[PDB]
């Protein structure tokens, strides 16, 4: 008999390619599975206006879904930062065995059920850039009072370090750069910075560390999931997880054609690299602030411990296989 | 209302991850349908055919399968392509391949003659050299011998004067032992620590041959199109859905295992073959490729393809994830 007519906020602007793909090609497959039972309808930044509203809005139940990333919400709980990506940590490959297998989807649903929020993968963007910027970064001395956007854990990291970062939403990123509002910036990589038009007025664009494995997140209202019939239940989680997947290859598939034209139509573009010095004082602050972070409560040892046991196991498999083949070939 | 359908598998039974694909993907096609589209899965102690499954597809007596696309090479050579390639794509960018830089589409060129439909079925990630009793120091060391290996891969080796040489599975550790082969490769710690290779054989090489090795559904084309469109695409979905989860499977389980390996058996030595070799067979397999593409139009636009956008994927592999494993 009933039909069910949900809404969807997403942090991303309008006709956001690959990250406002993956939620459009989430409700389409909802709708076709579901015979028009179950739709979706998404709102983008331009509508609801709250880019980081988003975990309000699947809180309360405002809206019954939200695509944005876990990180985001570190204000509201740091335990929210892991679920995303950590510096040094896993590549993307490494990261849904850590999910699907390695308990990953079950330590995250006992962080986000106090919310009575679902979450769930919701696209990776692989090994991200380390940014643009400015003026080269020669020593620690250049991080210190550097404004710059960049989230999560590396954002703490940095910030150990002198840095000033901050979370500003992408709609807002170009405009806070060209004012020098922030000095640099990290988004993601040649799958959606060039677009953004970062290049234009910061020419050093860095390689990463900082996020190898980005996932982003669907979060769904518990109580709106409850109120499904099961087989509804079961292809909305079915739908997600098959559109986060297929996220992965189109940032993969757009990263190999926009590399392509970077290496061809940017003269002003210089990649760049940060010193080993700069980064052995990187490396050291985040293990430095991971021992600080696990020893403050139980349930972040428990779950950096998993990340850092399971990415240990996995990525001798990764060195032995992918790597290997990669440095050789 | 209620759809009943079968799918045969090359596996024999409770044959995990390969195994564990077809399962979640049943599962995930009958919960989504409450019911109304399920699906029996034969395992080879069943239909008694693991290869098969292409003629069970085809002619309809199944609706479904699941193996691999280069066990077909016999029928047609062009079907080896959608597995994997020696020297070729790793699975995140064969993924990217796959849904987004054409490769659905020349699957489908390749498959709609024989009216059956074909999809990824779950990939291995990289695959290890293969289990070897002597080590192989030179190219002299590869003529004459006998080994298990698949796809195209076989072809290069026999092209240096090894004998690829063919053994069902469940006799594989038999084989070995029984030096009907002198080598093998399966899949890598995922799969072989169960076949107990190690046992026979104490050198375990790094791969090169199947750097991604993608499994494959079959769908009988008749079939599918009796099927409403919300169930068609449920059971889509379902597919793609479950191969994906076999990659994470088998990361996952390879991870698991290698560890297992690393404590438990202390004489499997870990080799990689000496330079000159693989320039060797290098050398053979871009010959060899060069020379079944001029034969077969078919077969020159798809490695085209396959070459033009493994170049292209692989500067951002070798950019993103390559350097940063070197690095840290
Ligand atoms: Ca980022
Ligand atoms: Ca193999
Ligand atoms: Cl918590």
Do not use: C
Request: net charge positive; glycine share 8%.
């Amino acid at each position: 008999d009933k039909k069910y007519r949900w809404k969807l906020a997403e942090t991303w602007g309008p006709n956001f390619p690959i990250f406002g793909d993956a939620t459009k090609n989430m409700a389409k497959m909802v709708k076709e599975m579901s015979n028009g039972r179950l739709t979706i309808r998404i709102d983008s930044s331009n509508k609801h206006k709250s880019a980081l509203g988003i975990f309000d809005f699947v809180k309360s139940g405002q809206y019954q879904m939200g695509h944005s990333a876990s990180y985001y919400w570190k204000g509201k709980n740091f335990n929210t930062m892991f679920f995303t990506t950590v510096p040094f940590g896993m590549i993307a490959s490494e990261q849904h065995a850590w999910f699907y297998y390695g308990g990953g989807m079950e330590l995250m649903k006992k962080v986000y059920d106090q919310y009575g929020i679902m979450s769930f993968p919701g696209g990776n963007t692989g090994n991200q850039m380390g940014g643009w910027f400015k003026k080269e970064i020669n020593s620690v001395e250049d991080l210190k009072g550097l404004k710059m956007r960049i989230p999560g854990f590396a954002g703490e990291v940095l910030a150990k370090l002198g840095a000033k970062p901050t979370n500003i939403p992408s709609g807002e990123l170009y405009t806070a750069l060209e004012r020098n509002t922030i000095d640099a910036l990290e988004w993601v990589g040649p799958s959606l910075d060039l677009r953004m038009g970062f290049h234009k007025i910061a020419p050093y664009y860095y390689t990463g560390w900082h996020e190898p494995g980005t996932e982003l997140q669907f979060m769904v209202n518990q109580k709106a999931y409850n109120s499904l019939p099961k087989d509804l239940q079961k292809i909305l989680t079915v739908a997600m997880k098959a559109a986060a997947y297929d996220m992965y290859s189109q940032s993969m598939h757009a990263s190999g054609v926009n590399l392509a034209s970077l290496k061809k139509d940017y003269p002003n573009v210089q990649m760049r690299s940060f010193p080993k010095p700069v980064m052995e004082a990187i490396v050291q602050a985040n293990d430095e602030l991971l021992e600080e972070f696990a020893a403050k409560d139980p349930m972040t040892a428990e779950i950096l411990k998993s990340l850092n046991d399971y990415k240990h196991q996995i990525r001798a498999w990764t060195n032995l296989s992918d790597r290997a083949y990669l440095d050789n070939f």
